[PDB]
Design a protein around this motif. Structure first.
Motif, PDB file in Angstrom:
ATOM      1  N   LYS A 287      31.945  35.811  38.448  1.00 41.00           N
ATOM      2  CA  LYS A 287      32.422  36.047  38.625  1.00 41.00           C
ATOM      3  C   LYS A 287      33.878  36.299  39.311  1.00 41.00           C
ATOM      4  O   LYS A 287      33.381  36.804  40.911  1.00 41.00           O
ATOM      5  CB  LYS A 287      32.095  37.498  38.735  1.00 41.00           C
ATOM      6  CG  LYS A 287      32.388  38.960  38.791  1.00 41.00           C
ATOM      7  CD  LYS A 287      31.680  40.357  39.072  1.00 41.00           C
ATOM      8  CE  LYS A 287      32.505  41.666  39.121  1.00 41.00           C
ATOM      9  NZ  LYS A 287      31.649  42.424  39.338  1.00 41.00           N
ATOM     10  N   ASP A 292      38.408  45.064  41.568  1.00 46.25           N
ATOM     11  CA  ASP A 292      37.373  46.481  40.745  1.00 46.25           C
ATOM     12  C   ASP A 292      37.959  47.350  40.783  1.00 46.25           C
ATOM     13  O   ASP A 292      37.689  48.342  42.363  1.00 46.25           O
ATOM     14  CB  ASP A 292      35.807  46.108  41.256  1.00 46.25           C
ATOM     15  CG  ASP A 292      35.319  46.354  39.802  1.00 46.25           C
ATOM     16  OD1 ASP A 292      35.851  47.116  38.816  1.00 46.25           O
ATOM     17  OD2 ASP A 292      33.960  46.203  39.634  1.00 46.25           O
ATOM     18  N   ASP A 310      35.628  41.118  45.365  1.00 49.97           N
ATOM     19  CA  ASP A 310      34.089  41.576  43.890  1.00 49.97           C
ATOM     20  C   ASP A 310      34.683  39.784  42.776  1.00 49.97           C
ATOM     21  O   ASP A 310      34.445  39.910  42.079  1.00 49.97           O
ATOM     22  CB  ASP A 310      35.390  42.549  42.750  1.00 49.97           C
ATOM     23  CG  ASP A 310      33.816  43.063  42.025  1.00 49.97           C
ATOM     24  OD1 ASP A 310      32.566  42.839  42.309  1.00 49.97           O
ATOM     25  OD2 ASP A 310      33.904  43.555  41.423  1.00 49.97           O
ATOM     26  N   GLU A 371      32.685  45.762  34.230  1.00 52.29           N
ATOM     27  CA  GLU A 371      33.600  44.563  33.910  1.00 52.29           C
ATOM     28  C   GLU A 371      32.633  43.641  33.856  1.00 52.29           C
ATOM     29  O   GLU A 371      32.821  42.101  33.002  1.00 52.29           O
ATOM     30  CB  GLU A 371      34.349  44.426  34.545  1.00 52.29           C
ATOM     31  CG  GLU A 371      34.973  44.227  36.015  1.00 52.29           C
ATOM     32  CD  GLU A 371      34.242  45.195  36.810  1.00 52.29           C
ATOM     33  OE1 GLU A 371      33.369  44.572  37.750  1.00 52.29           O
ATOM     34  OE2 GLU A 371      33.126  46.455  36.958  1.00 52.29           O
ATOM     35  N   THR A 399      29.445  39.362  42.763  1.00 53.02           N
ATOM     36  CA  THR A 399      29.130  40.780  42.714  1.00 53.02           C
ATOM     37  C   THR A 399      28.895  41.557  41.602  1.00 53.02           C
ATOM     38  O   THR A 399      30.310  41.853  42.038  1.00 53.02           O
ATOM     39  CB  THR A 399      30.019  41.076  43.835  1.00 53.02           C
ATOM     40  OG1 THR A 399      31.101  40.843  43.007  1.00 53.02           O
ATOM     41  CG2 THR A 399      30.527  40.205  45.109  1.00 53.02           C
TER      42      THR A 399
HETATM   43 MN   LIG Z   1      32.583  44.505  39.437  1.00 52.33          MN
END
Ligand SMILES: [Mn+2]
Ligand SMILES: [Mn+2]
Ligand SMILES: [Mn+2]
Ligand SMILES: [Mn+2]
Ligand SMILES: [Mn+2]
Ligand SMILES: [Mn+2]
Lengths: 519, 519, 519
Positions: A287, A292, A310, A371, A399
């Motif tokens: 990720k 974010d 993030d 997301e 995360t």
């Molecule tokens: Mn996030």
């Protein structure tokens, strides 16, 4: 089109990451006695071990030892430090007094923890390095433990961070001028060669650098350029699917999440194939949410702070991959970085939008701030369907949830795993590396109903948030695994372990290295 | 500039709406006996009526009747269903057993409700259709009521929705493959011809489709194209005022609300003049907020979900218009669609901005999430000032306020009306159609002071939220009626009646059809 | 002093709980054929099994089987039910038609679940019993699984609850008149005798009754009287420490939590010693918070609803104890009920108050709504220091944290356990019983710093809520274990598993029975 001054700053920051070299080197007591002849590197020395280790007779043969140091060992508290001056001790800085800081490491360690307690080792050395007088000195760090891998990472993590914007450091590509060179001195020659330990420390610190960096510096574009730079230098393959091409090629998840942002989203895949026959084929997926903000489901300001972290899963996976290449580990690897900024604006994906994922499954977006599972869904399908091989093991690192902290806490990444065997092995790797993990509930039959949708195959948010929140996010991701894939899937939720109150920890790369090592 | 794959998807979705055909047909027992000769259309049949109707001797002459069905009638609960298998009953699917589902409709009905209780009819048939074995079957639905209009709309509403993204339906322009063909069988030949009932059902379902559709599919642009497509096919006039032209031509309200969005706002006016002399001239105006994020007054995520439904008033008015053209109802109509996305970004109209409305009146924006009354203000002025005729009646329909639910609830649209006569007629049309309404307080002298402004003619938000919130939004709209207009103004707040927990209801079109029918 | 009418109601409610008898009995197909000779007990029969089990040829020899039932088996959905009428089938109610409801149980079951999926069994039988025509009938429930313990508890849980206040039931001591007698018919004679399965079912339902009951009925006083009643009837010892005596004897935790309430707090200890040679010694401790308003840290109303369930741990432990006494299980038991109402008023313990616990340790109260860990602290010290024996194992059960749901979800109780062995055994007992559990992080070295206090030994609340919230509450409790205790400590957080949307589940007793069984 960015301003010229901002673009120059970004290029210099890219270069700083691509050329990053560690401040730490490793050796042992006999090699140190032989090379330095009882002359300390500087006016500061650090001595770290357990209550018992500190009282070993071998400690008395250390070049800085004297009755004051003996008293320090008596007065030091468990988990604390204690400093003493030693007069007329030979050192390369020509300092009149040498400061010797003793640190006591607990032996208490639960069955879910690393017995060597590298968490405390990190805090002890950090505290001791706060007593540094001058800049650009070398500090001798004498460690009484022989648990070389966890100590290497622990010391790499510790002290002042290589990323800094303080005191004109912005003009030096945000390379800190406050970091001390650290010479780690083990009791015995390390079971893992010093050059290998260096590579590990380097990856921990690079990971830390990427995570610490503010999003005005670490963007989807600069992260990509950094990956490309390392590909040129080390000779591994790099594939980039950029911006509108994501949409054209059916990657609706990552495209929709990232499309509102100034910098376009990117699916970046790195390939490494070892010389000779590989022990396993492993696909890594990270990720890489560079920031974010929540999207249209905008985070309040309190919660939006530290959302530059993030991308900690993409950093972890990227640097684990780098270590594997540098050490020529006999694992065939893919590393897919799911890079996007979750931004707010006119092109924002909406709470109500329906996404056509790369997997062909449709996702009703209930909440745009969930997301990560979406970009990872595209990532894992890519890894399991679109590459020149099919992996035996898929590891996704992210995360991902606030629930992770509530569930497994700040020091233990949550593991959601489809097989007992792969889970046990990742747990063992966490306990050996010091980058500890703990399982969360695996029960797909109970997770599945939380994502029921009226119009699409699934939603992206649990109907009931209080029904195994770490697990359900993991479940969502698994729905987008290719049917071609029949192997082990390891979901690692490292929301909290990637940072502490001093910033990034560089958690993840060493975990991976240790996992690969035992395959 | 959209990606090529997204544009192809949008075109296909447009076509799916323009060419939409209903799954429902209508007939009666004698015509069914004559055409099908006692052979059921499939392995499922549905029987729906009141306690008394279900015990009529005529029920025994129905082709699926037997002692098990008689027992079903005894055991079924009021408002519930009860299913039985009938062995060796002739059917076109060649099924060994036919499933017969009985449903009991209450007789209890308050003076503000439709006596035939089509609300329960809908739920009964929905529940019965959940027992469908195969896809693409025809299900015979025997109804014991002769209230043909409300039943037609009730059955059109029921079951699985024509809009779907499940199981690859995205590749078929989001046309559901899970919908059953339904043959509705009335006791007597319907007082309204079957082909007319079909047109009504079609409009209910198209309305439902438009409302269900996520905003990535139903945009200001695609909604406009859909209206244009129906204009070409049916031969009615279409006028479109697009984007910056709205600003140049003084439409400051709709322009300011919509200007932040990716897709420009549009004022779309449709004209139908019947062949004969018209019984009335009626101007319809619909709130077409394709998505209501709140603008700079950003909604929290919980409240932003289902805001794709914020165009329900435009859908209702559009599909009521279509029905009038298809049935050649003798009413001269305009239909103005106030199309915008209430988006957040750098071009966002602000909490403090002052708007010059088409009416010439200035509006101080207190809250950007009270956007509907603004777009409607421009709509109604357009209808009452800018057309080739002056209407006798203006009807505006809008998913306008949360207050609506609190005031009149989930099944009754709130009516704010300047004349007792027009109000009573719309109420009667609601009771006949099943698309029920209830009045809210009409008292302009008490609403007017809530909108006092320091610097503009008015604000867009009540000073005191707890002072007739449905009514005050209505009042705001009336301040922008042209002085040329001296007729009846009917404001319909349908915030909640346009949806339930299964999605869109297609509420509004049938209400209009019935209203026009009685003029 | 209560009103006379309220006191009579409380006595009657006490008696209803003390004399509670189950509605369920158990047998097998051959014994049923022999005793009932193919005549059904009533006009309803239920058939429940997996897709494969439902197609076993042995199913055809069941007395209600016919081609319609065969068709039901074909049409029924996984996890769903399907009902058919069978004409002229012999039954004791003399009904012309028998209704046969088939239910399909999934085979899918993760490694953390009960393979027999009793969760679905419960839901299926519940849905089938909703088709009951008359009151006071006996319903034959044919189950194709031989997993007798989990099915017994699953069926005990299902359908309408024995606790009811509907339709005049308040005048009948809140005994429901809507419950059907259920005859569970296994394929083979059950591996556990029917009378033993009855005792289990009885404990599940009594547990359910105690948890469902509103706090105006189930108070600290009535819960105590219920325990005393069972002690007189079954001949076990009961020790009660009441109200101000708690303070005089140093039980500052339970005293402080409960002292604001109308009804005084009580520490109630029950003792059972089996006949003969000495065996495993186990101390049970249950959180008996009759109602959790939050105290001065007042819950909002949304969160305060269903806080009558906050005594679920005391019920679970109490009923597990009863089952052990009734079945004469060879375990020596203590059962300590920590009974208090967490009430708001002038005598309320405060956010700032410092409590002297029975353990001698001082607790600074940060938040009065973290009351459970406090009462349990006194409970476990009582169990481990104050009894005539020292236990080998302490099990505490409590509806303790919101973090539990987030961590392990609605079907799995969280386990915080100091030994791997005891943990594994409790997990095994959960999978066998169907009352599933899952571990939470055990890492005292990381939990301990969350409770640091300026002036007392500890606080009652974590400084950082996002650092293993299930685990930290468990940790708190362990700080109050007597130093005399050196055995296994099992903390069971069952906040969510004790209820579902229909009310109490009776979760916990069967878990305990199965655990004791395997010792
Ligand atoms: Mn996030
Ligand atoms: Mn997020
Ligand atoms: Mn709106
Ligand atoms: Mn709004
Ligand atoms: Mn509580
Ligand atoms: Mn509480």
């Amino acid at each position: 089109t960015l301003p010229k001054a901002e673009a120059k700053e970004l290029s210099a920051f890219v270069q700083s990451c691509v050329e990053y070299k560690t401040n730490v080197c490793f050796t042992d007591v006999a090699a140190y006695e032989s090379n330095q002849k009882g002359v300390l590197s500087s006016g500061l020395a650090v001595l770290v071990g357990t209550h018992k280790q500190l009282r070993d007779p071998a400690v008395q043969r250390l070049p800085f030892y004297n009755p004051a140091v003996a008293e320090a060992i008596e007065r030091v508290k468990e988990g604390g430090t204690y400093g003493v001056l030693v007069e007329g001790l030979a050192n390369a800085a020509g300092s009149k007094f040498v400061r010797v800081v003793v640190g006591e490491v607990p032996t208490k360690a639960s069955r879910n923890n690393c017995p060597a307690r590298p968490d405390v080792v990190t805090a002890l050395v950090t505290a001791a390095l706060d007593e540094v007088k001058e800049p650009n000195t070398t500090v001798d760090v004498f460690v009484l433990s022989n648990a070389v891998l966890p100590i290497a990472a622990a010391v790499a993590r510790c002290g002042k961070h290589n990323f800094s914007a303080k005191d004109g450091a912005a003009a030096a590509a945000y390379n800190s001028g406050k970091v001390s060179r650290l010479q780690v001195v083990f009791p015995e020659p390390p079971a893992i060669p010093p050059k290998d330990l260096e590579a590990v420390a380097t990856s921990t610190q690079l990971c830390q650098r990427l995570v610490d960096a503010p999003p005005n510096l670490l963007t989807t574009a600069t992260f990509t350029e950094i990956a490309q730079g390392y590909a040129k230098a080390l000779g591994f393959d790099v594939d980039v699917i950029c911006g509108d091409d994501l949409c054209e090629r059916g990657y609706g998840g990552i495209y929709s999440v990232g499309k509102a942002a100034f910098e376009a989203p990117r699916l970046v895949t790195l390939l490494y194939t070892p010389k000779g026959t590989p022990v396993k084929k492993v696909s890594l997926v990270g990720k890489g949410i560079v920031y974010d903000c929540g999207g249209l489901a905008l985070k309040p300001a309190d919660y939006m702070k530290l959302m530059k972290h993030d991308m900690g899963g993409a950093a972890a996976v990227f640097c684990g991959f780098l270590t594997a290449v540098r050490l020529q580990q006999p694992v065939q690897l893919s590393c897919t970085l799911c890079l996007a900024e979750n931004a707010i604006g006119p092109k924002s994906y909406r709470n109500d939008d329906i996404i056509v994922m790369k997997s062909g499954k449709t996702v009703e977006v209930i909440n745009t701030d969930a997301e990560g599972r979406i970009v990872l869904g595209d990532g894992v399908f890519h890894a399991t369907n679109e590459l020149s091989f099919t992996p035996d093991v898929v590891i996704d690192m992210a995360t991902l949830t606030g629930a992770q902290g509530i569930a497994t806490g700040r020091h233990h990444a949550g593991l959601y795993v489809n097989e007992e065997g792969a889970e046990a092995a990742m747990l063992r790797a966490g306990r050996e590396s010091g980058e500890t993990c703990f399982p969360v509930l695996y029960c797909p039959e109970y997770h599945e109903p939380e994502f029921k949708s009226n119009h699409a195959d699934m939603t992206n948010l649990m109907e009931r948030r209080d029904n195994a929140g770490v697990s359900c996010a993991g479940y969502f991701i698994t729905t987008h695994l290719s049917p071609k894939f029949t192997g082990a899937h390891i979901h690692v939720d490292l929301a909290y372990p990637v940072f502490n109150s001093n910033g990034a920890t560089g958690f993840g790369p060493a975990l991976l290295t240790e996992y690969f090592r035992k395959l």
